[PDB]
C-alpha cells in the first residue's frame, strides 16, 4: 500500500547490469529498496508514493538504457522459456561454423608432418615479398569474420559504451580488435620493407574465438532453461476453458456454455468430464469421485472427494461427471498464489548474493587493467633485460630479430589474459542454485519463500512448537461426561443441553467438539438460547442460558479453567481437585462445569497426538537443534504430552495475549529461534521469530508473517525443510569457489607467468576453457534435481536402535 511497484525489464544480458541498475536507483533520493532478478528479468522497487511516480521510474530505467514496463499477470511462459535466445545462439553458432572449419583444417595441416609429403607443405609459398598465400587466405577469412560475425558484439559494446558502465562484450571486442590491428600493421610493415619472410600473424584467432563464444553461450542458455522446469510445469498446468451449466430447479442442466477464465466469475456452476482438469476452485455439489494433485501438493495418494468437499484448480478428475459451484476464480486460486509466491521467492537476495553482485560490477575494468599492465610489463622486461627471457628463448632467428619476438609474445599474452576471464560464471553462480533449490522444494510440498530464509535455516539452533493444530490432530474427541452435583434436579440431559447451547455462541476448537457430541447423544436437532456470553480468551466463558425446554422435553453458566471459577468466586474442593488427575496426566485436558454456582460435573476432552510427532522431535535433537513446546493449558496437561513426544522444556499457562515475550527472551541471548505455528492464529508470534513456519495450511498459502509455508500436515516436512536448506546453502559456497579458483588460476597462466615451466596458450585456447566454465557452474546447480524425498522408513533407519525414553521427572516448566 506504500506504492510498492513491480516491473519487468527486457534486455539484461550481462550480470553486471544488476549492480548498475540497483546502485542508480538506490542512490536516487526517495527510494529505500531495489531488488532485480536477472533470471526472471523483473524488478521490485518500493518508494515514497507522493515524491515520484511509476512513470518516473520507467523514465529513469529508459535513461539507463533498458526497456521496462508494468508487470503483467498471466503471461510468463516466454520469460522462463529462454526459447528466443537459445534459437538465436544456435543459429549464430551454425552460421559461424562455416568459417571455423576451413581455418581449423589449415591450422591442423600445418602441425602434422606428412611421412612422405607431396611437396613438404608448400602452402606457405611466398609470392610477393612479405605476403605469403597462407596469410592472404587468413586475411580474407578474418576480414569476412570481422565484418560479418562480430557485428552483434560490436552493437552490444557500442550500446554499453554510450553509458559509464561496461558489459562483458567489451572484452571480446577489445580482444578481436587488437588481434586484428596488430597483425594488419605487422603485415603491412613486412610488405612495405620488402622482407623475404612472412611473419606469423594474428589472423587465426578471430575465426576460432567466435565459434567457441557462440557454442558456450548456446550451451549455457540450454542449461539455464532446465532450471525453470518447476515454474514452467506449474504455470502451464491451469486450464483456460470451462463448461458452464445452469440449474433449473433440481440441478437440472438447462444449457451448456464454454467460457474463458477472464469472463467466468464467482458463483457460477461448472461441470467436468472424467479426465478433465478442474478449472476453478469451488465446493463439490453432487457426485462421488476422486482426484490426484501430485503436481500441486506433491502427495502420491489420490484424495477421495464427496459432495460437500473442496477441490483444487489444477487437479485431474477420474470418475464420472461432477458439478461444483465456483468460489475462487483467477488470481484467487491456490495454484496462482503458489506460482506468485515462488516468483517473488527469487527476489529477496541474500547478503552473500549482494556481495556477489557487488564484486561482479567491478570485474571488467579490473581485467582490462590487468591486461594492459601485463602488456606493458612484458614489453619493458623484454626491451630492458633480454637475458631472462632469452634464457627460455635461446634460439637466434635471422628471419625475425629478437625485438619482434618480445612484442609478439607480449601481445599474445595480453590478449589471452582478457580472452580467458569469465564474468558470467561468477555472476550466475548463486541465482541458479537458489532457483533450483526453491523449485525442488516447491515440488515436494515445502514452499520456502525468499532467499534470506534459505541461509537463515542453516544456523538455527532452537525450534519452537505450539500444541494444538501443530503437534496433535486438532479435532478433539470427547471421552466422557461426569456429574458432580445433583442428579434429580440436574439430570444428564439438562446439563449437556445447557452447556451445548451456551457454547454454541463460541467457536473455540474444543467447545465445538463438545457441542456436536452433545447433539449426537441427545439426538435433538434443536437448541435453546444463550445470553450475556462473556468470552475471555485463554480464561473461559461465562453466560446465562434461556429457553431450556427445547431439549429437556425429549442459569448463569460459567465454563473455563480452574482460575476462571476463581475469578467468579467459586470455592475449592478436594474431590474435584483430583477428579481430572486420573485423566489429566494421561494427556487429555478436562473442562469443569459450574452453573449458578453449582458444581454440576466434569468432562474429559482428548485430542490424539499425531504419529509423526514421535520421530520429528528426535531427529532435530540428534541434528543439533533444541526443541521447546509452548501452550496455554494447565501444567499437568503439558507435562503429560511433553513426555509422550520427548520435549524436556515446556512453556505452559501462557495466555494467548502475550505469546511473544517468551520468543523475545529466547532471542535475547543472541541465538536464532524459529517457531512452528499454525497460520492465521499465531501471526504475531511467527513475525517476531527469525523464521516463521506455517504448518497445516492447505489452500491458504497467502501468509505474510511466515517465511516457510507447508501445505501437507506433516511434521517430518519440518525436518525436510531444514535438511534441504542446508543442502542448498552449501551449493552456493561450492559454486562461488569454482568461479574463483578458475579465475585466479586462469589469469596467471594466460599472463605467461608459467613460461619457465613451458606452458603457453594461444588465444583460441583461452576461450574454449571459458565456455566450459560457464556451463560447469550451471551443471553443478542442476545436480540438486537428483533429490529423492526421504520416506518414513528412511527416518526409521538412521533413528533405529537408540530412542531414549524420558519420565516427567526430567521435564522442566516455564518461569514466572
Q: How far apart are CA 718 and CA 691, in angstroms?
A: 12
**According to the binding rule CB under 5 A, does residue 778 interact with Pt ion?**
no
**What x-and-dash track marks residues 112-151 binding Pt ion by CB under 5 A?**
----------------------------------------
- Nearer of residues 171 and 513 to Pt ion, judged by Cβ: 171
**According to the binding rule CB under 5 A, does residue 772 interact with Pt ion?**
no
CA nearest to 709, candidates 692, 726, 722, 725: 692
Q: How far apart are CA 589 and CA 41, in angstroms?
A: 54
- Nearer of residues 172 and 638 to Pt ion, judged by Cβ: 172
Specify the stretch interacting with Pt ion by CB under 5 A; choose among 170-178, 477-485, 710-718, 741-749. 170-178
Smallest distance, Pt ion to C-beta of residue 182, A? 19
Specify the stretch interacting with Pt ion by CB under 5 A; choose among 166-174, 332-340, 565-573, 615-623. 166-174
**According to the binding rule CB under 5 A, does residue 616 interact with Pt ion?**
no
Specify the stretch interacting with Pt ion by CB under 5 A; choose among 129-137, 171-179, 734-742, 753-761. 171-179
- Nearer of residues 171 and 629 to Pt ion, judged by Cβ: 171
**According to the binding rule CB under 5 A, does residue 739 interact with Pt ion?**
no
Specify the stretch interacting with Pt ion by CB under 5 A; choose among 168-176, 366-374, 491-499, 747-755. 168-176
- Nearer of residues 170 and 264 to Pt ion, judged by Cβ: 170
**According to the binding rule CB under 5 A, does residue 173 interact with Pt ion?**
no
- Nearer of residues 171 and 579 to Pt ion, judged by Cβ: 171
**According to the binding rule CB under 5 A, does residue 14 interact with Pt ion?**
no
Could you give the residue ranges of the DSSP H alpha helices within 490-580?
A: 492-503, 509-522, 549-552, 562-567, 574-577
Contact 779, 771 (CB under 8 A): no
- Those residues whose C-beta lies under 8 Å from the C-beta of residue 517, and which sit 6 or more positions away, are 478
What Cα–Cα distance (Å) separates residue 414 from each residue in 145, 243, 750, 766? 22, 68, 8, 11
**According to the binding rule CB under 5 A, does residue 417 interact with Pt ion?**
no
CA nearest to 689, candidates 447, 446, 461, 451: 461
**According to the binding rule CB under 5 A, does residue 213 interact with Pt ion?**
no
**According to the binding rule CB under 5 A, does residue 38 interact with Pt ion?**
no
Strand order in the sheet with 598-606: 477-483, 598-606, 590-595, 556-560, 540-546, 529-536
- Those residues whose C-beta lies under 8 Å from the C-beta of residue 730, and which sit 6 or more positions away, are none
- Nearer of residues 24 and 217 to Pt ion, judged by Cβ: 217
Smallest distance, Pt ion to C-beta of residue 175, A? 8
Smallest distance, Pt ion to C-beta of residue 412, A? 17
**According to the binding rule CB under 5 A, does residue 209 interact with Pt ion?**
no
Smallest distance, Pt ion to C-beta of residue 747, A? 12
- Nearer of residues 213 and 719 to Pt ion, judged by Cβ: 213
Among 21, 43, 145, 171, binds Pt ion (CB under 5 A): 171
- Nearer of residues 445 and 763 to Pt ion, judged by Cβ: 763
- Nearer of residues 333 and 774 to Pt ion, judged by Cβ: 774
- Nearer of residues 157 and 719 to Pt ion, judged by Cβ: 157
197 is written with which cell numbers?
619472410
Tally the residues of the chain.
816
**According to the binding rule CB under 5 A, does residue 215 interact with Pt ion?**
no
SS in 3 state form for 217-235? HHHHHHHHCCCCHHHHHHH
Cβ-based neighbour number of residue 4 at 10 Å: 11
- Nearer of residues 356 and 771 to Pt ion, judged by Cβ: 771
CA 399 to chain centroid: 63
Contact 750, 422 (CB under 8 A): no
The strand pair at 477-483 and 462-466 is best described as unpaired
**What x-and-dash track marks residues 547-586 binding Pt ion by CB under 5 A?**
----------------------------------------
Smallest distance, Pt ion to C-beta of residue 119, A? 41
- Nearer of residues 171 and 208 to Pt ion, judged by Cβ: 171
Q: Is 775 strand, coil or helix?
A: helix
What Cα–Cα distance (Å) separates residue 243 from each residue in 156, 266, 323, 353? 50, 14, 10, 47
**According to the binding rule CB under 5 A, does residue 518 interact with Pt ion?**
no
Smallest distance, Pt ion to C-beta of residue 734, A? 23
Specify the stretch interacting with Pt ion by CB under 5 A; choose among 165-173, 350-358, 512-520, 589-597. 165-173
**According to the binding rule CB under 5 A, does residue 615 interact with Pt ion?**
no
The count of residues interacting with Pt ion (CB under 5 A) is: 1
In the numeric block, the cell 469472463 is attached to 263
- Nearer of residues 171 and 775 to Pt ion, judged by Cβ: 171
Smallest distance, Pt ion to C-beta of residue 357, A? 19
Smallest distance, Pt ion to C-beta of residue 769, A? 12
DSSP class of residue 806? -
* Residue 752 Ramachandran class (φ > 0 left, ψ -120 to 50 alpha, else beta): left
Q: How far apart are CA 426 and CA 701, in angstroms?
A: 34
Q: Is the dihedral of CA 713, 714, 717, 719 positive or negative?
A: positive
CA 456 to chain centroid: 13
**What x-and-dash track marks residues 80-109 binding Pt ion by CB under 5 A?**
------------------------------
137 is written with which cell numbers?
587466405
Smallest distance, Pt ion to C-beta of residue 215, A? 14
Binding site for Pt ion (CB under 5 A): 171
Amino acid at each position: 500500500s506504500d506504492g510498492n511497484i513491480e516491473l519487468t525489464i527486457t534486455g539484461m544480458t550481462c550480470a553486471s547490469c544488476v549492480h548498475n541498475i540497483e546502485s542508480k536507483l538506490t542512490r536516487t533520493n526517495g527510494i529505500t529498496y531495489a531488488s532485480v532478478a536477472l533470471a526472471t528479468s523483473k524488478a521490485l522497487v518500493k518508494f515514497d508514493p507522493e515524491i515520484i511516480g511509476p512513470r518516473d521510474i520507467i523514465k529513469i530505467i529508459e535513461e539507463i538504457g533498458f526497456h521496462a514496463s508494468l508487470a503483467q499477470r498471466n503471461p510468463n511462459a516466454h520469460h522462463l522459456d529462454h526459447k528466443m535466445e537459445i534459437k538465436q545462439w544456435k543459429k549464430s553458432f551454425l552460421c559461424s561454423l562455416v568459417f571455423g572449419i576451413p581455418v581449423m583444417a589449415l591450422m591442423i595441416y600445418m602441425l602434422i608432418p606428412s611421412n612422405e609429403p607431396h611437396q613438404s607443405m608448400v602452402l606457405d609459398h611466398n609470392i610477393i615479398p612479405g605476403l605469403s598465400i597462407l596469410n592472404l587466405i587468413f586475411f580474407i577469412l578474418c576480414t569476412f569474420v570481422q565484418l560479418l560475425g562480430g557485428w552483434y558484439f560490436y552493437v552490444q559494446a557500442y550500446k554499453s559504451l554510450r553509458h559509464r558502465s561496461a558489459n562483458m562484450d567489451v572484452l571480446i571486442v577489445l580482444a578481436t580488435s587488437i588481434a586484428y590491428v596488430y597483425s594488419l600493421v605487422i603485415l603491412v610493415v613486412a610488405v612495405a620493407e620488402k622482407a623475404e619472410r612472412s611473419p606469423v600473424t594474428f589472423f587465426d584467432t578471430p575465426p576460432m574465438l567466435f565459434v567457441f563464444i557462440a557454442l558456450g553461450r548456446w550451451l549455457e542458455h540450454l542449461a539455464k532453461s532446465k532450471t525453470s522446469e518447476a515454474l514452467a510445469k506449474l504455470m502451464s498446468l491451469q486450464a483456460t476453458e470451462a463448461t458452464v451449466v445452469t440449474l433449473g430447479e433440481d440441478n437440472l442442466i438447462i444449457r451448456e456454455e464454454q467460457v474463458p477464465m477472464e469472463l467466468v466469475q464467482r458463483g457460477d456452476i461448472v461441470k467436468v468430464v472424467p479426465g478433465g482438469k478442474f478449472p476453478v476452485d469451488g465446493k463439490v455439489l453432487e457426485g462421488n469421485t476422486m482426484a490426484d494433485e501430485s503436481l500441486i501438493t506433491g502427495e502420491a495418494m489420490p484424495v477421495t472427494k464427496k459432495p460437500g468437499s473442496t477441490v483444487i484448480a489444477g487437479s485431474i478428475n477420474a470418475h464420472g461427471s461432477v458439478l461444483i459451484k465456483a468460489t475462487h476464480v483467477g488470481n484467487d486460486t491456490t495454484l496462482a498464489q503458489i506460482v506468485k509466491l515462488v516468483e517473488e521467492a527469487q527476489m529477496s537476495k541474500a547478503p552473500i548474493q549482494q556481495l556477489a553482485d557487488r564484486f561482479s560490477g567491478y570485474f571488467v575494468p579490473f581485467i582490462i587493467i590487468m591486461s594492459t599492465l601485463t602488456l606493458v610489463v612484458w614489453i619493458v622486461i623484454g626491451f630492458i633485460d633480454f637475458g631472462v627471457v632469452q634464457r627460455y628463448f635461446p634460439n637466434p632467428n635471422k628471419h625475425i630479430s629478437q625485438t619482434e619476438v618480445i612484442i609478439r609474445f607480449a601481445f599474445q599474452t595480453s590478449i589471452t589474459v582478457l580472452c580467458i576471464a569469465s564474468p558470467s560464471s561468477l555472476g550466475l553462480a548463486t541465482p541458479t542454485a537458489v532457483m533450483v533449490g526453491t523449485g525442488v522444494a516447491a515440488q515436494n510440498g515445502i514452499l520456502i519463500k525468499g532467499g534470506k530464509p534459505l541461509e537463515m535455516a542453516h544456523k538455527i539452533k532452537t525450534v519452537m512448537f505450539a500444541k494444538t493444530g501443530t503437534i496433535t490432530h486438532g479435532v478433539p474427541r470427547v471421552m466422557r461426561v461426569l456429574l458432580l452435583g445433583d442428579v434429580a434436579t440436574l439430570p444428564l440431559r439438562k446439563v449437556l443441553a445447557v452447556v451445548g447451547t451456551a457454547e454454541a455462541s463460541s467457536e473455540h476448537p474444543l467447545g465445538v467438539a463438545v457441542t456436536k457430541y452433545c447433539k449426537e447423544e441427545l439426538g435433538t436437532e434443536t437448541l435453546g438460547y444463550c445470553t450475556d456470553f462473556q468470552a475471555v480468551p485463554g480464561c473461559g466463558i461465562g453466560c446465562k442460558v434461556s429457553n431450556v425446554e427445547g431439549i429437556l422435553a425429549h442459569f448463569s453458566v460459567l465454563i473455563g479453567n480452574r482460575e476462571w471459577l476463581r475469578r467468579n468466586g467459586l470455592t475449592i474442593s478436594s474431590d474435584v481437585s483430583d477428579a481430572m488427575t486420573d485423566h489429566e496426566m494421561k494427556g487429555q485436558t478436562a473442562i469443569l462445569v459450574a452453573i449458578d454456582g453449582v458444581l454440576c460435573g466434569m468432562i474429559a476432552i482428548a485430542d490424539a497426538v499425531k504419529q509423526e510427532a514421535a520421530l520429528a522431535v528426535h531427529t532435530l535433537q540428534s541434528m543439533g537443534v533444541d526443541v521447546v513446546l509452548i501452550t496455554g493449558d494447565n501444567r499437568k496437561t503439558a507435562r503429560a504430552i511433553a513426555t509422550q513426544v520427548g520435549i524436556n522444556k515446556v512453556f505452559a499457562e501462557v495466555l494467548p495475549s502475550h505469546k511473544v515475550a517468551k520468543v523475545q527472551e529466547l532471542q535475547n541471548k543472541g541465538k536464532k529461534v524459529a517457531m512452528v505455528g499454525d497460520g492465521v492464529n499465531d501471526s504475531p508470534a511467527l513475525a517476531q521469530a527469525d523464521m516463521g513456519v506455517a504448518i497445516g495450511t492447505g489452500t491458504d498459502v497467502a501468509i505474510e508473517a511466515a517465511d516457510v509455508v507447508l501445505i501437507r500436515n506433516d511434521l517430518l516436512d519440518v525436518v525436510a525443510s531444514i535438511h534441504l536448506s542446508k543442502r542448498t546453502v552449501r551449493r552456493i559456497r561450492i559454486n562461488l569457489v569454482l568461479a574463483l579458483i578458475y579465475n585466479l588460476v586462469g589469469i596467471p597462466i594466460a599472463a605467461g607467468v608459467f613460461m619457465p615451466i613451458g606452458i603457453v596458450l594461444q588465444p583460441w585456447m583461452g576461450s574454449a576453457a571459458m565456455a566450459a566454465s560457464s556451463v560447469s557452474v550451471v551443471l553443478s546447480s542442476l545436480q540438486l534435481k537428483c533429490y529423492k524425498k526421504p520416506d518414513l522408513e528412511r527416518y526409521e533407519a538412521q533413528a533405529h536402535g537408540h530412542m531414549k525414553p524420558l519420565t516427567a521427572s526430567q521435564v522442566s516448566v516455564h518461569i514466572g
